[PDB]
DNA sequence: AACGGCGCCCGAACAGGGACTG
DNA sequence: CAGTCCCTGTTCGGGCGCCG
């Protein structure tokens, strides 16, 4: 009884044609059971090889959850429908969400299955379930309703979502509610007991219309930044000053007021690295001035909503991971550090996966975008293990870099 | 008026703005003429082929090749121009089944559908685009032209349609027989069950009659009832499997196309034969771009070829997969970037073997290449068994712990244990984390001219030691590596080295033990002889330490 | 002399970043 | 600042094996 919203690709682009990657036994068995129930409910339908489009599919389990969730890697289809969920039917981002004391994330993607999808667009939602040892050919489906993981689903459902959330927002005018992908971000300044109580009231508002029982809690007011800090030693050697000047010289690309004149004067000659060098009166003066500039904010740094976010991560060792978010180089909108995450001191890939999910969540709360990641890992290493540790219903863009640490910039 | 087959048709379109094929026929031998007129006549009476007239302004050349191990002929249609104008299909064949992934079954039957593509219909609106003439005489009768009502052999959409059509027909039978395993690869069917021999044949006949309802015939010609079963190029026995006999050519003079076939068979043989190497054989296929050019076998390629033929002498076999037991993968280092592995569940009962000899990167070490082999085995195991095997690796836990905790990139290996089988994988030198007290400090630098390709490399030290070496036909990067090599040559067992080269430092910090660069290999040899080496970096052109002094000497 | 799938080892073409020169 | 170079990386198409 609902007219399908017409959806068209960006002019000059064809649909996604991405190959399905191998899946483990437990993931294939989970997807076969899930897709059977969805096909019985008409959410998906089997298709043939005349559909040249395809999108990878796998399964995940959210944090502290034993239930399999179907996850489609619609990253290719999403950037091929960019003028739809950003230009036509866009969702405004509330600036006050990051200022709230507590923000809870609710999975509402199940509500998208009640709205049919445009018949002319269903061919782009094709996916293929693989088989172990290739016992059978790939089993192909396509979506008949709004699929989870497609950025067009919350855009079309936005009109439906507003009417459902209309009474609750009137009851609580101070609560900020933001919708991104399959998730719903609900922030308030109430106390922990009052907040969780108001979250349950919102759940009942959705029930009177399978992951709604979960509630991942955030605290954006408790989020910290990791500034550039300089060491403080009682004695300084030639090697210590060479490392300090190298760090300050690289930092000059960010803070143009940093000077290294009086510090380079301490290294006059061809001295041994371990030779202790006492800091002169002017060297103490120059080093004290540089420590204050690192406390001052960077000039002309602000968020441009038309530019993409970029995230770089550095492996610091011993469970330490630093990261920077920027749109223009050396114009970081946010820097931070993570420590003692899951897999610390045993698994780099699980930690890196955890860090990517944390950074993406922060970017959704602060700017409403997911950054493109520059991952410090080999492509084949990441593509082998990352799905084993993924616990989110979205997937950000990423690329792979290899930058040896010539100088510890973000973590001495 | 042709009867419509029970198999649902697949709606096939063409790329917009393009028409059908209009290619002239190919003059063929009279032997091919007497082999195709009898086929088009039989397919016309069976409804598989309809006759057309002048209302079909299309044409496509055809030919034929002999069926493998038979007297029958395979009718092919060179649809290379039709494929360019036909819509793209998404392939549903995602891989190749492997016998090591098969479980133990009491009863096994291997079927084979007769006239696979000739039993699945074509799209109604698409049959007009498949036109082809058949001359009865090579230069007399014009020959009546026909069309296709089924799937032609040679079309780029025929495999995808048959594989999808075969699945929809087997879906109702599999729902009625869940405990029966049916490996569906193209038209060949592998049917297994734990039922008794008598009850197994009963369900086989039920399946044969089920497929017959859609016009799929399973003739007794290629019906296999007794082991060993020939399936996917293997010999399937009740409790073991092996590859069909592989014949390696033994020519007195070796060319380029002969080695390409030789390495290919060894790659196919290395899945069950442990220890097959193709490094020195494939090394001969470099640079030479003439398939008909004789290449003499080197002494390393001859000893490698002799060791491969000896492995193929003794017969080997793999076992089948038991889900109640764990998967074990053990890797051995074969030297020169060569790795071999075996996957098993019980000791010395290999499911399959394999090798990893890929050399990625100009500079690497054994620890990186072992990590790459683990990743290759893991993904391969997920395809075949859907899980990751426990690894037995020839690297100490302490060695691996030192590498991954100190590397700047994220790296990881799944659950594994150490196996003490030399040669063990280790790191051949460790850069210090702090400068060395009492060790001479070398400030190295190197400059080169972009035009004349001339350059210098040298160092200055805190004790006054100094050297400058002129270099001809070099680069700035090479002089920076040369400067470090000079410092390592002229220093004691413990040395501090200060450089401004981000290029040189990045190479050495990754602790490589092998390199495509002779200069880097010499640097590695010196680093191994040392007891303590501390590399430090400083920004260039900043008047920092002795780096300013050595910069004047070389530039 | 046809089509599709998977694997390997190969070279050519292309991309991207530090560093030097106009 | 552009425009190069040097160096290293990935991508892709073809050679071969193998299956149908
Ligand atoms: C070997 C081969 C096969 N095919 C396609 C056609 C039918 C299926 C199976 O081929 P087949 O089993 O050898 O021949 P088929 O048509 O089934 O006839 P039968 O010998 O089984 O009776 O794959 C092909 O197009 N080109 C080929 O070279
Ligand atoms: Mg057959
Ligand atoms: Mg230099």
């Amino acid at each position: 009884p609902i007219e399908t919203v017409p959806v068209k690709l960006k002019p000059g682009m064809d649909g996604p044609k991405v190959k399905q990657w191998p899946l483990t036994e437990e993931k294939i068995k989970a997807l076969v059971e899930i897709c059977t129930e969805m096909e019985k409910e008409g959410k998906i339908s089997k298709i043939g090889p005349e559909n040249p489009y395809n999108t990878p599919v796998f399964a995940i389990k959210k944090k502290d959850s034993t239930k399999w969730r179907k996850l489609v890697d619609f990253r290719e289809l999403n950037k091929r429908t960019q003028d739809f969920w950003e230009v036509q039917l866009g969702i405004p981002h509330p600036a006050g969400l990051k200022k709230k004391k507590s923000v809870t994330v609710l999975d509402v993607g199940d509500a998208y299955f009640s709205v049919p999808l445009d018949e002319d667009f269903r061919k782009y939602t094709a996916f293929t379930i693989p088989s172990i040892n290739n016992e059978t050919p790939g089993i192909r489906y396509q979506y008949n309703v709004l699929p989870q993981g497609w950025k067009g689903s919350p855009a079309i459902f936005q009109s439906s979502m507003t009417k459902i959330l209309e009474p609750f927002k009137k009851q609580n005018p101070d609560i900020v509610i933001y919708q991104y992908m399959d998730d719903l971000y609900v922030g308030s300044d109430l106390e922990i007991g009052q907040h969780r109580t108001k979250i349950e009231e919102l759940r009942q508002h959705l029930l009177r219309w399978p992951f709604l029982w979960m509630g991942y809690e955030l605290h954006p007011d408790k989020w910290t930044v990791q500034p550039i800090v300089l060491p403080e030693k009682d004695s300084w050697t030639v090697n210590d000053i060479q490392k300090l000047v190298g760090k300050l010289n690289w930092a000059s690309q960010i803070y143009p007021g940093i000077k290294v004149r009086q510090l380079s004067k301490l290294l006059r000659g061809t001295k041994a690295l371990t030779e202790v060098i006492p800091l002169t009166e002017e060297a103490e003066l120059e080093l004290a001035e540089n420590r204050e500039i690192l406390k001052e904010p960077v000039h002309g740094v602000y968020y441009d909503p038309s530019k993409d976010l970029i995230a770089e991560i550095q492996k610091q060792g011993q469970g330490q991971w630093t990261y920077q978010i920027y749109q223009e180089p050396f114009k970081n909108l946010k820097t931070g550090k993570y420590a003692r995450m899951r897999g610390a001191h045993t698994n780099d890939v699980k930690q890196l996966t955890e860090a990517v999910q944390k950074i993406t969540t922060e970017s959704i709360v602060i700017w409403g975008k997911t950054p493109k990641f520059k991952l410090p890992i080999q492509k084949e290493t990441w593509e082998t293990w990352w799905t084993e540790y993924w616990q989110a219903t979205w997937i950000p863009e990423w690329e792979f870099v290899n930058t040896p640490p010539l100088v510890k910039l973000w973590y001495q | 008026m042709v009867p419509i087959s029970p198999i649902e048709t697949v709606p096939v379109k063409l790329k917009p703005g393009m028409d059908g094929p209009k290619v002239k026929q190919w003059p063929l031998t009279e032997e091919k003429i007497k082999a195709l007129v009898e086929i088009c006549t039989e397919m016309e009476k069976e409804g598989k082929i309809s006759k057309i007239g002048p209302e079909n302004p299309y044409n496509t050349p055809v030919f034929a090749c002999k069926k493998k191990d038979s007297t029958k002929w395979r009718k092919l249609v060179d649809f290379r121009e039709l494929n360019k104008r036909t819509q793209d299909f998404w392939e549903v064949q995602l891989g190749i089944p492997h016998p090591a992934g098969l479980k133990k079954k009491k009863s096994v039957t291997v079927l084979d559908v007769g006239d696979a593509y000739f039993s699945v219909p074509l799209d109604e609106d698409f049959r007009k685009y498949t036109a082809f003439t058949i001359p009865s005489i090579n230069n007399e009768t014009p020959g009546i032209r026909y069309q296709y009502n089924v799937l032609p052999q040679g079309w780029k959409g025929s495999p995808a349609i048959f594989q999808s059509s075969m699945t929809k027909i087997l879906e109702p039978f599999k729902k009625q027989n869940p405990d029966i395993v049916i490996y569906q690869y193209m038209d060949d069917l592998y049917v297994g069950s734990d039922l008794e021999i008598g009850q197994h044949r009963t369900k086989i006949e039920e399946l044969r009659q089920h497929l017959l309802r859609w016009g799929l015939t399973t003739p007794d010609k290629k019906h296999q009832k007794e082991p060993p079963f020939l399936w996917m190029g293997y010999e399937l026995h009740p409790d073991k499997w092996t590859v069909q006999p592989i014949v390696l050519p033994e020519k007195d003079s070796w060319t380029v196309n002969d080695i390409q076939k030789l390495v290919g068979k060894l790659n196919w043989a290395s899945q069950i034969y442990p220890g097959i190497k193709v490094r020195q054989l494939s090394k001969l296929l470099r640079g030479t771009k003439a398939l008909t050019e004789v290449i003499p076998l080197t002494e390393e390629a001859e000893l490698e070829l002799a060791e491969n033929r000896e492995i193929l002498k003794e017969p080997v076999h793999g076992v089948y997969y038991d889900p109640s037991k764990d998967l074990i993968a053990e890797i051995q280092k074969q030297g020169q970037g060569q790795w071999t592995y075996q996957i098993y569940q019980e000791p010395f009962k290999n499911l399959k073997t394999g090798k990893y000899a890929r050399m990625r990167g100009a500079h690497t070490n054994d620890v990186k290449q072992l990590t790459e082999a683990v990743q290759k085995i893991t993904t391969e195991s997920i395809v075949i068994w859907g899980k990751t095997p426990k690894f037995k690796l020839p690297i100490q836990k302490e060695t691996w712990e030192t590498w991954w905790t100190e590397y700047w990139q994220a790296t990881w290996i799944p659950e594994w244990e150490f196996v003490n089988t030399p040669p063990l994988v280790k790191l051949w030198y460790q850069l210090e984390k702090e400068p060395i007290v009492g060790a001479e400090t070398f400030y190295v630098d190197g400059a080169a001219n972009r035009e004349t390709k001339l350059g210098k490399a040298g160092y200055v030290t805190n004790k006054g030691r100094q050297k400058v070496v002129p270099l001809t036909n070099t680069t700035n990067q090479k002089t920076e590596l040369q400067a470090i090599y000079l410092a390592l040559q002229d220093s004691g067992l413990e040395v501090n080295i200060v450089t401004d080269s981000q290029y040189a430092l990045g190479i050495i910090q990754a602790q490589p033990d092998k390199s495509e660069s002779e200069l880097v290999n010499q640097i590695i040899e010196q680093l191994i002889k040392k007891e303590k080496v501390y590399l430090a970096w400083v920004p260039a052109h900043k008047g920092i330490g002795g780096n300013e002094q050595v910069d004047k000497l070389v530039s």
Side-chain angles (χ1 to χ4, degrees), chain B residues 281-300:
Chain B
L281 294 181
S282 300
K283 196 176 182 180
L284 311 180
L285 302 180
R286 297 176 180 176
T288 294
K289 297 186 177 183
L291 294 180
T292 61
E293 194 187 282
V294 49
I295 289 189
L297 301 185
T298 64
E299 187 177 5
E300 290 76 13

Side-chain angles (χ1 to χ4, degrees), chain B residues 333 366 393-396 418-426 428:
Chain B
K333 175 185 175 181
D366 287 334
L393 306 181
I395 179 177
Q396 298 282 1
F418 167 68
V419 52
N420 199 334
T421 54
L424 299 186
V425 172
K426 66 171 189 175
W428 297 86

Side-chain angles (χ1 to χ4, degrees), chain A residues 25 46 49-50 52 133-135 138 140 239 249 267 269-271 273 315 347-348 376-378 381 389 401-402, chain B residues 87-88 90 92 94-95 97-98 171 183-184 375 383 386 404 407-410 412 441 443 462 534 542 545-546:
Chain A
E25 177 168 359
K46 292 185 175 180
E50 71 276 10
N133 199 20
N134 297 100
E135 174 182 354
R140 293 180 47 79
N239 177 71
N249 178 75
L267 303 173
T270 306
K271 298 176 179 298
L273 286 190
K315 171 185 173 186
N347 194 324
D348 274 334
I377 190 175
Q378 291 303 311
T381 300
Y389 313 108
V401 302
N402 196 345
Chain B
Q87 65 165 108
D88 296 338
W90 186 262
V92 296
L94 312 184
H98 196 277
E171 192 184 306
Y183 268 72
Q184 172 198 340
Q375 298 166 358
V383 175
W404 81 259
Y407 202 28
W408 57 83
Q409 282 200 323
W412 184 72
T441 300
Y443 294 85
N462 62 292
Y534 177 75
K542 291 296 174 181

Side-chain angles (χ1 to χ4, degrees), chain A residues 329-374:
Chain A
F330 311 102
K331 300 303 178 184
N332 295 322
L333 305 174
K334 175 175 174 55
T335 70
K337 184 177 67 66
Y338 296 143
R340 223 161 65 185
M341 301 175 300
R342 66 191 199 109
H345 313 291
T346 176
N347 194 324
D348 274 334
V349 181
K350 181 190 294 185
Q351 294 170 78
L352 181 56
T353 293
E354 182 70 20
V356 171
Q357 299 177 181
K358 292 187 174 185
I359 295 161
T360 304
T361 294
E362 295 176 0
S363 300
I364 295 168
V365 167
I366 301 174
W367 303 286
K369 286 180 176 179
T370 64
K372 186 175 183 180
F373 284 87
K374 297 186 172 180

Side-chain angles (χ1 to χ4, degrees), chain A residues 175-393:
Chain A
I175 291 182
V176 172
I177 300 182
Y178 177 59
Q179 182 185 4
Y180 189 81
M181 292 291 295
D182 308 340
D183 296 321
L184 201 67
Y185 295 80
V186 188
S188 67
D189 296 324
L190 302 180
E191 291 297 331
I192 305 180
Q194 296 289 343
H195 177 82
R196 301 179 183 183
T197 298
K198 265 58 180 58
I199 295 296
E200 186 63 30
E201 301 179 6
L202 185 59
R203 294 191 180 98
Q204 306 299 330
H205 259 260
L206 306 180
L207 293 179
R208 58 178 57 96
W209 183 91
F211 297 89
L212 192 56
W213 64 272
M214 298 181 60
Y216 192 73
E217 289 182 351
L218 304 174
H219 300 283
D221 62 326
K222 305 298 181 180
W223 292 351
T224 177
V225 303
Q226 183 74 4
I228 303 179
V229 297
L230 298 179
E232 298 186 4
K233 299 182 173 62
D234 53 328
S235 60
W236 297 77
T237 67
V238 171
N239 177 71
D240 292 332
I241 302 179
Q242 288 179 359
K243 281 165 56 182
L244 178 58
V245 175
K247 183 172 181 175
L248 290 166
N249 178 75
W250 194 94
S252 64
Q253 304 177 290
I254 304 172
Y255 305 85
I258 300 179
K259 301 300 179 181
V260 291
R261 304 178 184 180
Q262 298 297 332
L263 292 176
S264 299
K265 291 183 178 182
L266 302 176
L267 303 173
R268 288 178 180 180
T270 306
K271 298 176 179 298
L273 286 190
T274 57
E275 170 173 330
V276 179
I277 301 302
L279 307 186
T280 59
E281 185 178 5
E282 298 80 12
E284 295 283 355
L285 173 62
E286 190 186 41
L287 183 58
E289 285 179 69
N290 286 336
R291 285 198 178 95
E292 292 293 337
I293 303 180
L294 296 179
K295 302 176 182 178
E296 302 174 359
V298 186
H299 168 57
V301 170
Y302 56 91
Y303 171 69
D304 190 337
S306 75
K307 297 180 181 175
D308 295 336
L309 291 176
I310 303 176
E312 297 179 355
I313 304 174
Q314 298 86 41
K315 171 185 173 186
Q316 297 292 349
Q318 306 306 307
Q320 302 281 348
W321 302 78
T322 54
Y323 68 92
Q324 300 78 40
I325 306 175
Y326 61 91
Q327 293 176 312
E328 298 293 339
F330 311 102
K331 300 303 178 184
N332 295 322
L333 305 174
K334 175 175 174 55
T335 70
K337 184 177 67 66
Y338 296 143
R340 223 161 65 185
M341 301 175 300
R342 66 191 199 109
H345 313 291
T346 176
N347 194 324
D348 274 334
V349 181
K350 181 190 294 185
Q351 294 170 78
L352 181 56
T353 293
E354 182 70 20
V356 171
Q357 299 177 181
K358 292 187 174 185
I359 295 161
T360 304
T361 294
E362 295 176 0
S363 300
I364 295 168
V365 167
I366 301 174
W367 303 286
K369 286 180 176 179
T370 64
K372 186 175 183 180
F373 284 87
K374 297 186 172 180
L375 301 180
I377 190 175
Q378 291 303 311
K379 176 176 183 293
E380 294 76 15
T381 300
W382 179 256
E383 292 192 343
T384 304
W385 312 114
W386 76 271
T387 57
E388 283 298 289
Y389 313 108
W390 199 257
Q391 302 166 320
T393 66

